[PDB]
Scaffold this motif. Structure first.
Motif, PDB file in Angstrom:
ATOM      1  N   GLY B  19       0.799  -1.211   0.000  1.00 60.49           N
ATOM      2  CA  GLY B  19       0.000   0.000   0.000  1.00 60.49           C
ATOM      3  C   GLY B  19       0.836   1.266   0.000  1.00 60.49           C
ATOM      4  N   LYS B  20       2.057   1.169   0.520  1.00 62.05           N
ATOM      5  CA  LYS B  20       2.941   2.326   0.621  1.00 62.05           C
ATOM      6  C   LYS B  20       3.794   2.514  -0.630  1.00 62.05           C
ATOM      7  CE  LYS B  20       5.210   3.395   4.406  1.00 62.05           C
ATOM      8  NZ  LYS B  20       4.905   4.850   4.491  1.00 62.05           N
ATOM      9  N   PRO B  21       3.752   3.723  -1.214  1.00 60.79           N
ATOM     10  CA  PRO B  21       4.587   4.069  -2.369  1.00 60.79           C
ATOM     11  C   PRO B  21       6.064   3.840  -2.066  1.00 60.79           C
ATOM     12  CG  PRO B  21       2.937   5.756  -2.013  1.00 60.79           C
ATOM     13  CD  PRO B  21       2.851   4.826  -0.834  1.00 60.79           C
ATOM     14  N   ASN B  22       6.819   3.418  -3.073  1.00 59.61           N
ATOM     15  CA  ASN B  22       8.215   3.049  -2.887  1.00 59.61           C
ATOM     16  C   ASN B  22       8.989   3.157  -4.198  1.00 59.61           C
ATOM     17  OD1 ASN B  22      10.603   2.012  -1.765  1.00 59.61           O
ATOM     18  ND2 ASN B  22       9.504   0.435  -0.604  1.00 59.61           N
ATOM     19  N   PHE B  23      10.258   2.765  -4.162  1.00 54.06           N
ATOM     20  CA  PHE B  23      11.096   2.762  -5.353  1.00 54.06           C
ATOM     21  C   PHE B  23      11.684   1.381  -5.624  1.00 54.06           C
ATOM     22  CE2 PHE B  23      11.457   7.045  -7.008  1.00 54.06           C
ATOM     23  CZ  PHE B  23      10.971   7.823  -5.977  1.00 54.06           C
ATOM     24  N   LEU B  24      11.514   0.915  -6.855  1.00 52.98           N
ATOM     25  CA  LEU B  24      12.115  -0.328  -7.313  1.00 52.98           C
ATOM     26  C   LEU B  24      13.479  -0.046  -7.939  1.00 52.98           C
ATOM     27  CD1 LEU B  24      11.925  -3.350  -7.733  1.00 52.98           C
ATOM     28  CD2 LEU B  24      10.672  -2.928  -9.867  1.00 52.98           C
ATOM     29  N   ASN B  25      14.504  -0.686  -7.380  1.00 54.50           N
ATOM     30  CA  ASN B  25      15.887  -0.531  -7.813  1.00 54.50           C
ATOM     31  C   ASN B  25      16.474  -1.798  -8.427  1.00 54.50           C
ATOM     32  OD1 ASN B  25      15.732   2.035  -6.701  1.00 54.50           O
ATOM     33  ND2 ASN B  25      16.824   1.469  -4.822  1.00 54.50           N
ATOM     34  N   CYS B  26      17.039  -1.645  -9.619  1.00 56.66           N
ATOM     35  CA  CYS B  26      17.853  -2.671 -10.245  1.00 56.66           C
ATOM     36  C   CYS B  26      19.267  -2.128 -10.410  1.00 56.66           C
ATOM     37  CB  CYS B  26      17.283  -3.068 -11.604  1.00 56.66           C
ATOM     38  SG  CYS B  26      18.220  -4.377 -12.427  1.00 56.66           S
ATOM     39  N   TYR B  27      20.169  -2.613  -9.565  1.00 63.90           N
ATOM     40  CA  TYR B  27      21.561  -2.198  -9.592  1.00 63.90           C
ATOM     41  C   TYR B  27      22.389  -3.216 -10.370  1.00 63.90           C
ATOM     42  CZ  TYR B  27      26.237  -1.016  -7.825  1.00 63.90           C
ATOM     43  OH  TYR B  27      27.570  -0.692  -7.714  1.00 63.90           O
ATOM     44  N   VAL B  28      23.027  -2.750 -11.440  1.00 57.56           N
ATOM     45  CA  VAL B  28      23.859  -3.608 -12.279  1.00 57.56           C
ATOM     46  C   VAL B  28      25.314  -3.179 -12.167  1.00 57.56           C
ATOM     47  CG1 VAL B  28      24.347  -4.394 -14.606  1.00 57.56           C
ATOM     48  CG2 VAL B  28      21.981  -3.988 -13.910  1.00 57.56           C
ATOM     49  N   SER B  29      26.211  -4.131 -11.939  1.00 54.90           N
ATOM     50  CA  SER B  29      27.606  -3.777 -11.686  1.00 54.90           C
ATOM     51  C   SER B  29      28.612  -4.794 -12.223  1.00 54.90           C
ATOM     52  CB  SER B  29      27.825  -3.574 -10.185  1.00 54.90           C
ATOM     53  OG  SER B  29      27.325  -4.675  -9.447  1.00 54.90           O
ATOM     54  N   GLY B  30      29.887  -4.422 -12.205  1.00 52.12           N
ATOM     55  CA  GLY B  30      30.961  -5.335 -12.550  1.00 52.12           C
ATOM     56  C   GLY B  30      31.005  -5.814 -13.989  1.00 52.12           C
ATOM     57  N   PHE B  31      30.399  -5.062 -14.904  1.00 59.33           N
ATOM     58  CA  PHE B  31      30.357  -5.476 -16.309  1.00 59.33           C
ATOM     59  C   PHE B  31      31.284  -4.663 -17.214  1.00 59.33           C
ATOM     60  CE2 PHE B  31      27.727  -2.012 -17.884  1.00 59.33           C
ATOM     61  CZ  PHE B  31      27.083  -1.583 -16.740  1.00 59.33           C
ATOM     62  N   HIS B  32      31.473  -5.148 -18.439  1.00 55.17           N
ATOM     63  CA  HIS B  32      32.308  -4.473 -19.429  1.00 55.17           C
ATOM     64  C   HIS B  32      32.166  -5.174 -20.779  1.00 55.17           C
ATOM     65  CE1 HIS B  32      35.861  -1.678 -19.959  1.00 55.17           C
ATOM     66  NE2 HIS B  32      35.808  -2.298 -21.125  1.00 55.17           N
ATOM     67  N   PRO B  33      31.945  -4.406 -21.860  1.00 51.92           N
ATOM     68  CA  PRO B  33      31.924  -2.940 -21.949  1.00 51.92           C
ATOM     69  C   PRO B  33      30.699  -2.299 -21.307  1.00 51.92           C
ATOM     70  CG  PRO B  33      32.293  -3.975 -24.102  1.00 51.92           C
ATOM     71  CD  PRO B  33      31.770  -5.027 -23.184  1.00 51.92           C
ATOM     72  N   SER B  34      30.557  -0.991 -21.499  1.00 50.65           N
ATOM     73  CA  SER B  34      29.533  -0.213 -20.809  1.00 50.65           C
ATOM     74  C   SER B  34      28.130  -0.390 -21.388  1.00 50.65           C
ATOM     75  CB  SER B  34      29.913   1.270 -20.786  1.00 50.65           C
ATOM     76  OG  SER B  34      30.040   1.789 -22.097  1.00 50.65           O
ATOM     77  N   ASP B  35      28.043  -0.710 -22.675  1.00 55.29           N
ATOM     78  CA  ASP B  35      26.745  -0.926 -23.304  1.00 55.29           C
ATOM     79  C   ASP B  35      25.965  -2.011 -22.573  1.00 55.29           C
ATOM     80  OD1 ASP B  35      26.308   0.701 -25.943  1.00 55.29           O
ATOM     81  OD2 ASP B  35      28.410   0.073 -26.017  1.00 55.29           O
ATOM     82  N   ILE B  36      24.687  -1.747 -22.320  1.00 57.06           N
ATOM     83  CA  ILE B  36      23.853  -2.681 -21.577  1.00 57.06           C
ATOM     84  C   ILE B  36      22.386  -2.254 -21.581  1.00 57.06           C
ATOM     85  CG2 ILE B  36      24.263  -1.500 -19.383  1.00 57.06           C
ATOM     86  CD1 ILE B  36      24.160  -4.273 -18.033  1.00 57.06           C
ATOM     87  N   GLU B  37      21.488  -3.230 -21.687  1.00 55.80           N
ATOM     88  CA  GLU B  37      20.054  -2.960 -21.657  1.00 55.80           C
ATOM     89  C   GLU B  37      19.458  -3.374 -20.318  1.00 55.80           C
ATOM     90  OE1 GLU B  37      18.493  -1.327 -23.973  1.00 55.80           O
ATOM     91  OE2 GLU B  37      20.238  -1.256 -25.304  1.00 55.80           O
ATOM     92  N   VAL B  38      18.700  -2.472 -19.703  1.00 51.99           N
ATOM     93  CA  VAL B  38      18.063  -2.763 -18.424  1.00 51.99           C
ATOM     94  C   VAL B  38      16.607  -2.309 -18.415  1.00 51.99           C
ATOM     95  CG1 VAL B  38      18.095  -2.368 -15.938  1.00 51.99           C
ATOM     96  CG2 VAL B  38      20.252  -2.587 -17.193  1.00 51.99           C
ATOM     97  N   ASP B  39      15.712  -3.212 -18.025  1.00 56.12           N
ATOM     98  CA  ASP B  39      14.290  -2.895 -17.942  1.00 56.12           C
ATOM     99  C   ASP B  39      13.697  -3.373 -16.625  1.00 56.12           C
ATOM    100  OD1 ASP B  39      14.067  -1.674 -20.514  1.00 56.12           O
ATOM    101  OD2 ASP B  39      14.017  -3.667 -21.436  1.00 56.12           O
ATOM    102  N   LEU B  40      12.794  -2.578 -16.062  1.00 53.91           N
ATOM    103  CA  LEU B  40      12.062  -2.987 -14.873  1.00 53.91           C
ATOM    104  C   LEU B  40      10.701  -3.529 -15.292  1.00 53.91           C
ATOM    105  CD1 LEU B  40      13.022  -0.021 -12.529  1.00 53.91           C
ATOM    106  CD2 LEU B  40      13.871  -2.367 -12.418  1.00 53.91           C
ATOM    107  N   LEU B  41      10.337  -4.692 -14.760  1.00 51.26           N
ATOM    108  CA  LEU B  41       9.135  -5.386 -15.209  1.00 51.26           C
ATOM    109  C   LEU B  41       8.087  -5.550 -14.115  1.00 51.26           C
ATOM    110  CD1 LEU B  41      10.690  -8.207 -17.442  1.00 51.26           C
ATOM    111  CD2 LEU B  41      10.094  -5.855 -18.054  1.00 51.26           C
ATOM    112  N   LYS B  42       6.854  -5.184 -14.445  1.00 51.03           N
ATOM    113  CA  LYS B  42       5.708  -5.431 -13.582  1.00 51.03           C
ATOM    114  C   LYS B  42       4.795  -6.439 -14.265  1.00 51.03           C
ATOM    115  CE  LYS B  42       1.553  -3.223 -11.708  1.00 51.03           C
ATOM    116  NZ  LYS B  42       0.763  -1.962 -11.619  1.00 51.03           N
ATOM    117  N   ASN B  43       4.761  -7.658 -13.737  1.00 53.82           N
ATOM    118  CA  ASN B  43       3.981  -8.732 -14.340  1.00 53.82           C
ATOM    119  C   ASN B  43       4.455  -9.046 -15.756  1.00 53.82           C
ATOM    120  OD1 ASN B  43       2.286  -8.930 -12.016  1.00 53.82           O
ATOM    121  ND2 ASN B  43       1.064  -7.205 -12.778  1.00 53.82           N
TER     122      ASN B  43
END
Lengths: 9, 100, 276
Positions: B19-43
């Protein structure tokens, strides 16, 4: 602030 | 040349309370090269307004980024994080687990 | 306690797609405050912290200028690197540079940083004495001859010991409220099922700053390292950080394990057990 100096490779 | 995989962490900014508003975090690290696709998914669906931090890297030269969006944790909704990188055979999905 | 200002440059070539990208991000400790992206519609130094927005037009314009010069320089650096390693013009390559200053408690330069990498591997780095260079390979030693010939180390030392530290101090003053703070973590232990005879004790530390923190487990007083898992410290997105450390513990042995937390925001290091 960034550095004024950045010598080429 | 060596290319490194992305470590993925999916979590919430504040402790998850329904019920309480919040923030969904996806932290991506330790990769190389820098190019990368990231998406947050609801259902399994791409979330609307997703923000990310500015590209940066650690002492071992590996890159890191934080993707995040506003979300209200409830009971029926399922959340995940989909990441794609050159080091992967395809997109990798990590489900949001409230115990991690 | 001791503070630092660090800049991160990333240059990514992309053959057949025009100019290489160049991002520069500025940090004071664990807080980003400036960005510059050549892939922006109108490239320019932008504020990413509230305590830097009040900087005069001169600041942002000059910073933008320096950023652009750096971008061009690194664009040259990529081709030069192509020549040094005898590589094709088709591949995509990366150059990264981290440089900054650690403002020590004595108000003097505790440590100076100027290190760069090529395709994710050490290239050339300024040594602790701030007078000599360490080159990773024979290709970087060309650059070394170059920088030694022009006394680059002297100039950069001049920068680190002076302008860098000064600007760092100013930033620390203008953002005293968010930079000079030590927020202790909210901690707690959770239990999780694993096996018919095993379980997981996860130690949680949330909403702390700065990121530096020490999370450990002990078995009846003696440090425990086996069967442990400590995830990389992660950002909250609100200027805080999070971290947890888990341990696999046989059922019935829960009470014998304790979690230990060290953070500058804590008056005294914490000792935690799983509570009903």
């Amino acid at each position: 602030q960034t550095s004024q100096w950045d010598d080429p490779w | 040349m060596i290319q490194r995989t992305p470590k993925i962490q999916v979590y919430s900014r504040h402790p998850p309370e329904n019920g309480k508003p919040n923030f969904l975090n996806c932290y991506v690290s330790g990769f190389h090269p820098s190019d990368i696709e990231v998406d947050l998914l609801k259902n399994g669906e791409k979330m609307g307004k997703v923000e990310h931090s500015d590209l940066s890297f650690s002492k071992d030269w590996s890159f890191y980024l934080l993707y995040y969006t506003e979300f209200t944790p409830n009971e029926k909704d399922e959340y995940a994080c989909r990441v794609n990188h050159v080091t992967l055979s395809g997109p990798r999905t990590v489900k949001w687990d409230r115990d991690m | 306690g001791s503070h630092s200002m660090k800049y991160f440059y990333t240059s990514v070539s992309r053959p057949g797609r025009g100019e290489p990208r160049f991002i520069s991000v500025g940090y004071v400790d664990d807080t980003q405050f400036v960005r510059f992206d050549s892939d922006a519609e109108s490239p320019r130094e932008e504020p990413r912290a509230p305590w830097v927005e009040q900087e005069g037009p001169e600041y942002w314009e000059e910073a933008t200028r320096r950023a652009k010069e750096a971008a061009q320089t690194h664009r040259e650096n990529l081709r030069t690197a192509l020549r040094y390693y005898n590589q094709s013009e088709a591949g995509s390559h990366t150059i990264q540079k981290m440089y900054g200053c650690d403002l020590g408690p004595d108000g003097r330069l505790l440590r100076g940083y100027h290190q760069s990498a090529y395709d994710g591997k050490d290239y050339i780095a300024l040594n602790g004495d701030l007078r000599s260079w360490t080159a990773a390979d024979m290709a970087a030693q060309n650059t070394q001859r170059k920088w030694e010939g022009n006394r680059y180390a002297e100039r950069f030392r001049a920068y680190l010991e002076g302008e860098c530290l000064e600007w760092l101090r100013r930033y620390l003053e203008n953002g005293k409220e968010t930079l000079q703070r030590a927020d202790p973590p909210k901690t707690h232990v959770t239990h999780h099922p694993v096996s018919d005879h095993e379980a997981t004790l996860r130690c949680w530390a949330l909403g702390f700053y700065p990121a530096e923190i020490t999370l450990t487990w002990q078995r009846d007083g003696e440090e425990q390292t086996q069967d442990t898992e400590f995830v990389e410290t992660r950002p909250g997105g609100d200027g805080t950080f999070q971290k947890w450390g888990a341990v696999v513990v046989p059922s019935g042995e829960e009470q014998r394990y304790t979690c230990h937390v060290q953070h500058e925001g804590l008056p005294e290091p914490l000792t935690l057990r799983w509570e009903p």
